[PDB]
């Protein structure tokens, strides 16, 4: 049974805060002028172009899943009707993120390059594995575990590929494309915060046994996804010698994902000391 939403009676003021920020941050790939990166794009080697193409296609895969399956599967588990409305916005903006990469592809790359990059995403066992993991919980019947898998996607899985746009920006290359990605990262942060916030609200409704079972599940799912992401990172960044620094970025964001779910950071500072040039590219 449904019942028209009353935005004048909010059960959780945080729902309106996130709605105002996400809708107020509305944007489309046409807002970023990627045409100015044509010279910088041409200065990359065939291998550097191929790495960027595959990393970007991998980001599109997470965006396609989170918009088409992820955000929509959280609607029945909402605590308030406004949470449902906020979730529809996330599903839409995720589609905008996935389309932004095709706009970058259309402006910079050729048809043959795009087809090779998309065919690679179909065959890469690590990319397919991480999608099968979260998809099983999106389509499952455990609502709280679904929110943990959703938060881990927004706050951890995305950043294995978010490293490259920041790396290029640190080298004065593909600067406009990095601004496009920064608009995505700004949106992802709010999604991971909101979905993680709602996960904590559901944790307060269960018993102590369920709370401990979920903490174990989070650590198990994080490491299972991390072990798969380190293999994913090696196959891509080992040619350019960026693997060790991306792994620091991976651990750095895995701690952030844990804090979104209310848990404490796990990896120490000496394992998350990402190159400062990359962090300056973010902020």
């Amino acid at each position: 049974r449904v019942s028209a939403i009353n935005w004048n009676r909010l059960q959780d003021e945080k729902d309106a805060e996130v709605w105002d920020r996400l809708t107020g941050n509305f944007w489309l790939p046409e807002k970023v002028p990627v045409s100015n990166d044509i010279p910088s794009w041409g200065t990359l080697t065939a291998g550097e172009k191929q790495l960027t193409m595959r990393v970007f296609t991998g980001l599109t895969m997470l965006d396609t899943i989170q918009g088409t399956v992820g955000a929509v599967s959280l609607i029945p588990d909402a605590l308030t009707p406004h949470e449902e409305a906020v979730l529809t916005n996330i599903a839409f903006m995720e589609s905008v993120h996935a389309k932004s990469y095709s706009q970058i592809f259309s402006t910079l790359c050729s048809t043959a390059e795009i087809d090779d990059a998309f065919r690679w995403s179909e065959e890469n066992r690590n990319l397919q594995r991480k999608a099968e993991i979260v998809l099983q919980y999106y389509r499952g019947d455990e609502p709280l575990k679904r929110k943990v898998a959703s938060t881990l996607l927004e706050s951890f899985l995305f950043y294995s590929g978010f490293y490259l746009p920041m790396y290029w920006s640190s080298r004065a290359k593909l600067t406009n494309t990095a601004d496009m990605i920064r608009l995505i990262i700004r949106d992802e942060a709010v999604h991971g915060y909101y979905i993680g916030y709602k996960f904590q609200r559901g944790l307060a409704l269960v018993d102590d046994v369920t709370r401990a079972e979920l903490k174990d599940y989070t650590y198990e799912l994080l490491f299972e996804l991390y072990d798969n992401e380190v293999e994913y990172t090696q196959d891509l960044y080992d040619e350019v010698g960026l693997t060790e620094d991306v792994k620091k970025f991976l651990r750095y964001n895995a701690n952030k994902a844990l804090m979104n779910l209310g848990y404490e950071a796990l990896f120490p500072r000496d394992e998350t000391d990402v190159n400062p040039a990359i962090l300056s590219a973010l902020s």
């Binding site: 805060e17 920020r21 700004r186 916030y197 952030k256 950071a265 120490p268 500072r269 962090l279 973010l282």
Partner: protein, 129 residues
């Protein structure tokens, strides 16, 4: 002393608890007043663009002349994934006032953030003498 603010998510409130320093919270509804000098710990909540970024409950607490007079420093929480907006709420409080920008941290802060704020706040209070 320590005066901090946190919303319903309490990511900043939980960091202040892990600090172990006794602190007073700016309430989500209503005004309050502080007598002793204090350091402010607030998160950022801005969007696209120094107009905003600071919580409304903090603006009311800082609009109080008696409360603003005893402000000594600001520590901002946030998230590096916000681009130039990273902890920009502390930049707004530091610029529009005479107080300095002490520290930044993300969400609940790591174990190193708690040790860094404890030692930093102790050496900053000894500087006020």
């Amino acid at each position: 002393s320590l005066v901090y603010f946190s919303s319903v998510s309490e990511n900043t409130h939980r960091f202040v608890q892990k600090l172990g320093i006794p602190a007073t919270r700016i309430p989500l509804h209503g005004r309050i007043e502080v007598d002793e000098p204090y350091v402010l710990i607030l998160p950022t909540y801005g969007g696209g663009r120094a107009g905003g970024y600071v919580p409304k409950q903090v603006i009311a607490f800082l609009n109080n002349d008696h409360n603003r007079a005893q402000l000594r420093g600001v520590i901002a929480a946030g998230n590096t994934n916000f681009g130039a907006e990273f902890c920009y709420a502390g930049d707004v409080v530091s610029r529009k006032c005479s107080v300095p920008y002490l520290y930044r941290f993300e969400l609940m802060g790591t174990e190193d953030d708690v040790a860094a704020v404890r030692t930093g706040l102790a050496e900053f209070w000894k500087e006020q003498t």
